[PDB]
Write a protein that binds this ligand. Sequence first.
Ligand SMILES: CN1CCN(c2nc3c(F)cccc3c(=O)n2-c2ccc(Oc3ccc(F)cc3)cc2)CC1
Ligand SMILES: CN1CCN(c2nc3c(F)cccc3c(=O)n2-c2ccc(Oc3ccc(F)cc3)cc2)CC1
Lengths: 205, 50, 589
Amino acid sequence: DSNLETVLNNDGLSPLMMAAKTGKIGVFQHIIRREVTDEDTRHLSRKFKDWAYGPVYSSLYDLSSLDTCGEEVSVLEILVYNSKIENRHEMLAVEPINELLRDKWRKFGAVSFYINVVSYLCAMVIFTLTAYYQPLEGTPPYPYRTTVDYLRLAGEVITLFTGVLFFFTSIKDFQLLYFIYSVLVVVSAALYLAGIEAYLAVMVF
Amino acid sequence: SKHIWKLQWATTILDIERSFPVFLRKAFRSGEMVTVGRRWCFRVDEVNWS
Amino acid sequence: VFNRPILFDIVSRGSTADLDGLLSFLLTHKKRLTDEEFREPSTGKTCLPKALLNLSNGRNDTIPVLLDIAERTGNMREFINSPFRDIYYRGQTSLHIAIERRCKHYVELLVAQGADVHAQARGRFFQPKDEGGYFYFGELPLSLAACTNQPHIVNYLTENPHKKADMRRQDSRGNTVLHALVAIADNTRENTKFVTKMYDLLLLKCSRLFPDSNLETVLNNDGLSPLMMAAKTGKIGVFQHIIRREVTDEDTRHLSRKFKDWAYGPVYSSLYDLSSLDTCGEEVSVLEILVYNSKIENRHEMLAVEPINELLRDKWRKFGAVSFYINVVSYLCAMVIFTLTAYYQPLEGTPPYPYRTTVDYLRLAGEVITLFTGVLFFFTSIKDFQLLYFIYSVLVVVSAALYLAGIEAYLAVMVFALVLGWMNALYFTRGLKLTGTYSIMIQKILFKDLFRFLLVYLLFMIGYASALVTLLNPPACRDSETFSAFLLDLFKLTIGMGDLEMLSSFILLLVTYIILTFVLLLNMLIALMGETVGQVSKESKHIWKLQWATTILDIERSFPVFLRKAFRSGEMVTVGRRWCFRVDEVNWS
Ligand SMILES: CN1CCN(c2nc3c(F)cccc3c(=O)n2-c2ccc(Oc3ccc(F)cc3)cc2)CC1
Ligand SMILES: CN1CCN(c2nc3c(F)cccc3c(=O)n2-c2ccc(Oc3ccc(F)cc3)cc2)CC1
């Protein structure tokens, strides 16, 4: 009815997860490639073998628990994020994981990453060119009264929206670095709202 | 580079997926239906000369 | 016998009696198994490949019944030639499936029945891995038997009583068995053994069958040829053997490479046949592809194959030291006279025609010889680090053109061309023994970190200038909404070297920002310096090998090689002119 591997400890880990977390490459290297041949009990296999063209074997590794699609705990997350792992040098090279990372890269790892880097870099450049244009001759609260100042306000508002949006991303989840970043930026924008003189200091920081 | 950079892009990929909703149509493969295993799977193609 | 699924079910389990009572009725209904309704609709596959994939440990005894059915139907070509109609596969007829299964027990029977032995498998699944496919074998049945290590299949197929297979016939890319077998090869040992042995076998078989032309000379649409493909793709495993092939059989020895000529007892003078390692600049040359090409996977060992490593030395000795030293002296003297034309450069105005006295006559002589050198070596560049001299010489000729009209202050980029030429001399002339790795450090550093600096620099400047403008500029520099670039100049001058304007006497910002910029400058400088110089150095051996290889090759490319400055010629006729290069080894056997 139920393969014994699915019985989870009070920690809610399960044998494969405990093997990964504690740093047990010896048993982890085997628990992923288990394909017990007995058909009556083959269903509890991992390295499903599907086809081959003679020189090429297309193994069908069963990552039924190497990524829960962010639903529950995932072996890849514990393997990579956790720093207490004794030896991640070889565990990442188990095989299905090393290729799952490449698959994620190809599918949604280059597009999203480059979009993100360009978005961030352009956001910071417009932040700099809002600084260089930063409201001059006093009048911090509402200086927007001309075309160039209208463009400056447009830059400032888009930058504030970017900051608050990517702060929303941070909260929904180097993360501290952006956390302090965005709290500072939103605080500075709040002080700007009232046009408090010399209070747009930590904005440049 | 080797393991340090491996971990670097691993973290980038994982937190990329964590950022936006993964459950959308941007996940990994699905496999055999029933009577043998849906039990999604990931297919790796090796080559051997046996 | 009503639908494909039941046919597949019966053939999978190896049951034939249950099918006899219905196949006879279908044959009585003037029906043929080749009809699409008898073939799986997704790909159009017949039951033959399905049954073959259902081999009972290679002992499928039903497929003879299928051949009997085919003979009864009276249709053989369409049934046997039953390609796959999807894009994932192409062709892949009974021969392909049988050979893939490593089944010699039935390929022979089905060919004896009469089967197409030249079906072209131009499939998406049959295209190189790095291009997008899964397994590439040359799109030929015989090439498929050859690639998959089936010597018996190749032998039988080329010696079957019925239609045989010709090794010469090529594929979409014009590959043939040799090209395919170079493609699948690796640099391992298990792979490189069957590949090399069977590849010599195919070559020698084609030779006996047809001694007119050795199969190695059949070139793909890329115009590469098996040796060239082996070199380019980075196949040291097969390249190391294709150059030392000396098949002893006299009837077919002529297609040998490591010709052996003489020995004095302790010394063997091998006569390697570089019939295609240098075309004297006539056609593609293996050395050029090996050295110039950067996509080559592993040039570390390929250059050390042996005939190449010694051909480079031979070129060095013959026309590699003379020409190189003449070139370096000519360039260095050209740049020195360029500098001493600059220091003398037309003075007191009068740019167009200042030549009116002895010293000015000498200056004009220097200028004209320098212009002639620039235009001549630009002619050399065009006839063919080449970009560096390209921009060099275009700049110099443009400056000379502006000089012709004597346009005031227009001889500006002339001096920039001077400095470009000097750094170019520092660049190219790396053949003066090994001195660390100067040029390679250039490229690894070059401008990479410099623009990172510039950018962080500019952001800090703008950031603290914005601090000032929200504070004072409507401070130190007269606070009157002034220019910012002067802030950059100040930051370079003092926070870089000294004599700051204090600028506060504000502070919360400036102190943190300046300590941060110092910290960043430190880390960037130190990290770059240490990591680049220490670890990734790999100073001399292969880096310098490639360096003088490039110098020698482009030296030969410069002037006409076909002149009396080439490599050796060898045996005349009845054994091989077939120029050759003799390397003298010593062994104590
Ligand atoms: C908390 N944090 C977790 C990891 N993410 C992250 N953190 C950073 C950090 F901490 C410091 C500096 C930079 C970043 C950074 O760029 N990203 C990031 C941004 C976008 C992304 O992929 C997308 C692209 C477009 C899009 F519309 C939605 C998503 C992936 C990562 C997100 C939040
Ligand atoms: C395009 N380029 C290809 C390679 N060559 C070359 N490029 C350089 C470069 F790009 C930057 C800096 C320097 C050089 C350089 O010195 N040479 C060079 C010059 C002479 C030479 O051998 C001869 C000697 C005397 C003679 F009369 C005729 C030929 C061999 C090489 C030629 C053109």
